[PDB]
Amino acid sequence: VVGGTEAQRNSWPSQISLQYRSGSSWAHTCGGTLIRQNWVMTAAHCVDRELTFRVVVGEHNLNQNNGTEQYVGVQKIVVHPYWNTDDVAAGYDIALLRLAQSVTLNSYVQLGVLPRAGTILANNSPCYITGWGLTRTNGQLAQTLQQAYLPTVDYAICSSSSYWGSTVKNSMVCAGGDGVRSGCQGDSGGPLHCLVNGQYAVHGVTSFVSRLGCNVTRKPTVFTRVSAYISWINNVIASN
Numbered sequence: 001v002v003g004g005t006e007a008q009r010n011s012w013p014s015q016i017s018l019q020y021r022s023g024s025s026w027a028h029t030c031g032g033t034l035i036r037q038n039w040v041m042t043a044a045h046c047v048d049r050e051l052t053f054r055v056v057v058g059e060h061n062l063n064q065n066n067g068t069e070q071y072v073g074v075q076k077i078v079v080h081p082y083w084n085t086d087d088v089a090a091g092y093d094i095a096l097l098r099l100a101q102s103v104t105l106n107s108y109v110q111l112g113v114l115p116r117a118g119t120i121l122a123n124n125s126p127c128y129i130t131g132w133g134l135t136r137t138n139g140q141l142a143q144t145l146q147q148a149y150l151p152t153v154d155y156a157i158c159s160s161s162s163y164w165g166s167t168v169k170n171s172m173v174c175a176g177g178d179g180v181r182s183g184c185q186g187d188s189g190g191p192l193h194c195l196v197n198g199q200y201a202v203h204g205v206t207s208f209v210s211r212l213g214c215n216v217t218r219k220p221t222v223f224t225r226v227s228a229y230i231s232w233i234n235n236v237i238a239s240n
């Protein structure tokens with residue numbers, strides 16, 4: 001997250017760190033959202049590589065023991081069947097990870113609330129992106145969870161020529177674009193939490209930013225729109 005502030009330890013208890021095995025240790029690669037005690041929602045492109053992954057819930061500082069982490073293997077990966085690695089702009093950048101064990105819920109580990117199917121936010125709706133991604137374009141991962149206020153940019157504006165044009169689809173949410181705050185590499189797959197009727201819900205799964213850089217004016221961060229996949233998510237969970 002570029003232009004973020006450190007999240008308070010108990011702020012975003014559905015946020016997970018998706019990590020891959022790297023030699024004798026584990027490297028954060030993406031975010032995700034815990035949606036059942038044994039299911040995580042993340043981006044498809046996070047799991048294109050044939051790596052060994054684990055999920056960390058209750059995580060806050062990647063680099064130090066927080067006393068609150070649970071570490072759990074990924075047992076099954078279900079990518080959206082229409083996802084195509086060569087065409088992130090096509091959409092479908094979503095995947096569900098079934099965990100090897102059910103995690104224990106507490107103040108640091110909670111299920112993310114999902115929007116009702118079809119729900120679209122009015123332009124400039126209040127949202128926060130969270131994650132441990134790069135804190136600057138071509139920078140380094142955050143050690144502690146960051147959050148940035150990123151208000152939505154509605155489809156009409158987002159798909160106009162000076163924003164994302166035809167690259168953005170109505171299956172996506174755009175947020176930010178101020179040239180100061182944005183998602184950045186390592187945030188992918190994580191939540192965009194938006195305030196609706198008094199309650200934060202996870203409306204976005206972080207998907208991409210501009211090749212020109214993370215915080216680019218008129219290139220808001222782009223998220224898979226969770227509300228376009230509610231049936232799909234329910235169907236996968238019901239059949240696995």
Ligand SMILES: [Ca+2]
Binds near residue numbers: 060061062064
């Ligand atoms: Ca830690």
